[PDB]
Amino acid sequence: AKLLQILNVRVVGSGERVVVLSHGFGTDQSAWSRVLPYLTRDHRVVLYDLVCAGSVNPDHFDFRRYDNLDAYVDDLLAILDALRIPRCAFVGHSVSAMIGILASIRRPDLFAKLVLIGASPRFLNDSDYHGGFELEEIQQVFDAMGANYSAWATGYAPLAVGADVPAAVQEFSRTLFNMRPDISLHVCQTVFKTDLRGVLGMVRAPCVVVQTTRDVSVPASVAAYLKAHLGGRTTVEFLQTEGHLPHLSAPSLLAQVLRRALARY
Structure with a gap:
């Protein structure tokens, strides 16, 4: 209930098919703005900001609690339980x-x-x-984030976007610059400590893995790994362009994949 306000929860569209859109590091729910119109005639769509988003008051970020991803899962579950939603599809970046x-x-x-x-x-x-x-690599990243967060973010944004799409670089930069630098570092440390390989077979839901032709953070072999080890019926769907943020850099193409993947469930 309190989370609904704090994490900027919005419910738009309508339908018996409920979809949750959950953003990645350095963005907030506005990253979904260009694909959203392709979904809301057909679906009830739930959007929210992760507690680490710059659009959330940073004094809610409990460094002790958000030490691992289970605490972020708790927030998500609490939002859906508060909204009385018993069943949904979930899109996560x-x-x-x-x-x-x-x-x-x-x-x-x-x-x-x-x-x-x-x-x-x-x-x-x-x-x-x-x-x-590699470990030494992320150590240097962590140091750069502390030494000069703004220069780090400026350099990272075009690498994440991948394709030369200046509007997407500007937009991703905007929300990176909006994150409090200590929260950014903490989130990155948490993600790089996470290893879900052992629990992938516990997933029972069908899954669509979206693969682009290059992602600075996800080698091409990872999608096949997820398909081999996720416990539900899993497919890999391919976009014919590159990048880590296709919802920013190729939203119309990504929307095709989302419409197909969210048709029946």
Whole structure:
């Protein structure tokens, strides 16, 4: 109830098919603005901001509590329980794909289908596992975020967008610059400590994994890994463009995939 206000929860559209849109690091729910009109004639859509979003009052960010992703899952579940929603599809970008996987295991009754964008179960490399990052690399990232957050964000935004789409770079930069730098660092530390590989088989919901042709944070082999290990009926759907943020850089193309994936569940 209190969360509904604090996390800027909005319910738009209408339908018996309920869809939750959950954003990634460095954005807020406004990242969904261009795909949203493709969904609301057909679906009741629930949008909210993660507690770490710059659009949320940062004095709500309890560093102790949000030490791991279970606390973010708690928020999501509390929002849906407050709205009295018994069943939904969930679309999660980046860290929200991890949140969605965890939430679908905690409450399989509630999650009829997952759509995972910019998604990985583990960003750090391991033996025989290509996550895309090494420890020394993320250590330098963490130092850059502390030493000069604004310069770090300025350099990261075009790499995340990938394609040369200046409006998307400007928009992603806007919301990165809006995050409090200590909260940004903390979220990044939490995500890089997360490893969901062992629990993927506990997911029972059908899942669509969205793969773009290059993602700076998600190697091409990760989608096949998710398809091989997720416990529900899983497909990989391919976008014919690149980037980590296709909802910003190619929203009309992404919307095609979302309309198909959210048709029946």
